[PDB]
């Protein structure tokens, strides 16, 4: 059933699983027309498909051309997500195919179940977790490949960089969700925290800066502080 | 006008014949039901006074043979049997009629209710849903599970309704996932109507049989089947006009007949709200929408 606080360690066991987040698939800017009506303009989007154990990210870029001449795009976006996830699974060798796919939004369950009918032994699950994967497009290098795409493209990343050399999957996921929660709550402040010291850089082959173990503790503390501050403002508490 | 005689009534029982019902007392000199209209299937059904659990009964058609009821004190139920001796049977019925030991099927001349509930129901189709090929009549009860309920456990005692599953390879063409899920027309028209049922009359017959088993026996699997067959039509953008008009009449009489006090357990809120207010056919079931809104506005 649903993935929650109770069954959290299941994410880091040896059964292959993927999270799928569809919140950045269909993206628009809302604007005024010459006549003073409102219209949308689609921008490039992405499916965020993540192995929480390995950090392997399957970023399927959704080019605006897929929406051309289609109706009910927010509905279509869920089905297009399920179509591409199904295509990704079929593209993987059998021993790399997930045993579970966890969708971050309940509206993805039926579309993904119907597209995966050929895979009855792959469990499609919702989650009670409020995961901050919507903030993926606050990671500069992910935002850059999505916006520059001129056609449908899959790009593979490791969202943990080289962290698993030093820390467990559980700890790497916790760091990732804290970084993304901070970027979601106050992007400007989170990005300031991450780049404030010019001597710590991002390797060409990485997404995040090359912090020492001690620097990660300072960074993680600064991210927690950012999140609590923001929360006190949101709620006046 | 045909007759189903009873050998006796040794246990107190409520006896149903179609939409009618009569209380019979323990050892009451009751010897059966006469003046049964020829041309329809019928159901004769029982609920014992001492165990109001297990409603059970028999679907039959008096054109197919001479049927009677006899209590079995070993199995503890009223059983239908066929009398193969025409002259013995005619002589039993004539004696019981002369002694006026029989209730008369109480049909009002103006009243098309039973025809309207059984219009497409055919004994030969019932006998394929309820498999007991040595009898010309079919036993159903409250507890019998469906082939579909059994997949999700004695196969000989199952209701073999046509399996309908909206999230199945049968329902969804590879490459038309979204189209086939949101518009079930290919599943309704190609798979079910052209493929399995062959025509709308056989589809309606099974829908009507499912409803009657739900109503008369509280058979939960039957209720599921009735709603699935309604939802499959209402969820199709493309349905022949004659089928929608006929479905409105079918459902109207079913909703009209349902006991008011059983709407809570026999009507699925989600399906009826979806069918009447959200579905492609939300505006195609005028009679059904009006009777549902006037009789069960709470459910909606």
Swiss-Prot record, chain A:
The MPN (JAB/Mov34) domain has structural similarity with deubiquitinating enzymes, but lacks the residues that would bind the catalytic metal ion. It comes from the Eukaryota. It is found in: Nucleus. Residues 7-237 are annotated as: RNase H homology domain. This is Pre-mRNA-splicing factor 8. The chain holds residues 1836 to 2069 of 2413 of the full protein. Component of the U4/U6-U5 tri-snRNP complex composed of the U4, U6 and U5 snRNAs and at least PRP3, PRP4, PRP6, PRP8, PRP18, PRP31, PRP38, SNU13, SNU23, SNU66, SNU114, SPP381, SMB1, SMD1, SMD2, SMD3, SMX2, SMX3, LSM2, LSM3, LSM4, LSM5, LSM6, LSM7, LSM8, BRR2 and DIB1. Present with 468 molecules/cell in log phase SD medium. Functions as a scaffold that mediates the ordered assembly of spliceosomal proteins and snRNAs. Required for association of BRR2 with the spliceosomal U5 snRNP, and the subsequent assembly of the U4/U6-U5 tri-snRNP complex. Functions as a scaffold that positions spliceosomal U2, U5 and U6 snRNAs at splice sites on pre-mRNA substrates, so that splicing can occur. Interacts with both the 5' and the 3' splice site, as well as the branch region. Has a role in branch site-3' splice site selection. Associates with the branch site-3' splice 3'-exon region. Also has a role in cell cycle. Changing residue 21 to A: Alters protein folding. Severely impaired growth. Strongly reduced growth at 35 degrees Celsius.
UniProtKB/Swiss-Prot annotation, chain B:
Its main location: cytoplasm. GO terms for cellular component: cytoplasm; U5 snRNP. The lineage of its organism: Eukaryota, Fungi, Dikarya, Ascomycota, Saccharomycotina. Present with 7330 molecules/cell in log phase SD medium. Component of the U5 snRNP complex that is required for spliceosome assembly and for pre-mRNA splicing. Involved in splicing pre-mRNA of the A1 cistron and other genes that are important for cell growth. Phosphorylated on serine and tyrosine residues. This is A1 cistron-splicing factor AAR2. Residues 244-265 are annotated as: Leucine-zipper. It holds the Pfam family AAR2. The modification Phosphothreonine is found at residue 257. Keywords: Cytoplasm, mRNA processing, mRNA splicing, Nucleus, Phosphoprotein. One of its GO terms (biological process) is spliceosomal snRNP assembly. It is found in: Cytoplasm; Nucleus. Heterodimer. Interacts with PRP8 (via RNase H homology domain and MPN domain), competing with BRR2 for the same binding site. Component of a U5 snRNP complex that contains at least the U5 snRNA, PRP8, SNU114, AAR2, SMB1, SMD1, SMD2, SMD3, SME1, SMX2 and SMX3, but is not a component of the U4/U6-U5 tri-snRNP complex. The keyword Hydrolase does not apply. The modification Phosphoserine is found at residue 236. Belongs to the AAR2 family. InterPro entries: AAR2 (IPR007946), AAR2_C (IPR033648), AAR2_C_sf (IPR038514), Aar2_N (IPR033647), AAR2_N_sf (IPR038516).
